[PDB]
Description:
Blueprint: H1 5-13, H2 24-30, H3 35-46, H4 49-52, H5 57-69, H6 80-94, H7 105-117, H8 127-132, H9 136-140, H10 146-157, H11 172-187, H12 194-206, H13 221-236, H14 244-267, H15 283-305, H16 311-325
This protein binds the ligand COc1ccc(-c2cc(C)cc3c2O[C@H](C2CCOCC2)C=C3O)cc1OC and zinc ion (2 copies).
Ligand 2SR is lined by residues 191-192, 194, 236-237, 254, 275, 286, 289-290, 294.
Amino acid sequence: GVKTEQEDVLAKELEDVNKWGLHVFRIAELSGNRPLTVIMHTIFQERDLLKTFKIPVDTLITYLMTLEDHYHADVAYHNNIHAADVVQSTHVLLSTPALEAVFTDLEILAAIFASAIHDVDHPGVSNQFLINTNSELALMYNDSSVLENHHLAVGFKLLQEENCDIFQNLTKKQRQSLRKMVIDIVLATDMSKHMNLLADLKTMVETKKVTSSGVLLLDNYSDRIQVLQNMVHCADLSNPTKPLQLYRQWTDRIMEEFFRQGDRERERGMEISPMCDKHNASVEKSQVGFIDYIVHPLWETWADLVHPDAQDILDTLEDNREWYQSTI
Ligand SMILES: COc1ccc(-c2cc(C)cc3c2O[C@H](C2CCOCC2)C=C3O)cc1OC
Ligand SMILES: [Zn+2]
Ligand SMILES: [Zn+2]
């Protein structure tokens, strides 16, 4: 009835679960390639989600393992480790002082659950690849947010496997609201939606209202969901805000995933996608443009929303940007 030493070492790493820069890859190793399961379990227990939503523990574990099993181990970036990272990052962002007492338990559950499932069954190629190959997935979703629609459908469908229905004790009301929020959040992870999301986030920053003491004020679904969508989108694009040792591991993986798509594209005379050509790439330059044009504007805007809780995150982002730029 006592942990093995490896379990104890895993446990000690998991004590960083509330902090930016968790050793997520070490957790993946220590857990036997169960970072999503262990980190979700730890988070649910930390936030008392099992008791609040009456989720039987074995059902939660069975669903998590099942969810995790449907991420592809042969996918360098969009895998269970990325899922785990986004979950934990969303978890940290939920706990930002500027958002204290803003969100309900159901909204908290929605953001975390959405994070966990948001990339499930990712084949490691882009929507455009799937569209251009006339893939069954593309035809299923009429070429529109193909992967993101698929991630949702899988994440929900898996609740129907043996002893996986973690929402079995929620009321119809709770389930309908949870489901709508989850769907809105994951569809907002489609990068084609980025400019619009960010514009709306800015608009809210300009017209934001604080509150008794201090803390954002969100008094309609549109505003609450938009913040959750951006929060998870921020989590999704959080790699460059992490300590360089982490960021670089992510960059290696996404680049490996991209070049592999480029290889499959070249193999069949398809035009090679941006950043996917292993022969004509500039990893450093791509990362800088990525930060300058996407990541930094997002996080700058987010940091304004929760001023000044995200200052350290922004500073890390700029340091990493300078580092990459420093390297041609
Ligand atoms: C217009 O949509 C996009 C805008 C920027 C990017 C983009 C551009 C650069 C230079 C680098 C990156 C990038 O997105 C990828 C990630 C791929 C999975 O979704 C989140 C972003 C990782 C980069 O390091 C990708 C987009 O589509 C996935
Ligand atoms: Zn995705
Ligand atoms: Zn993702």
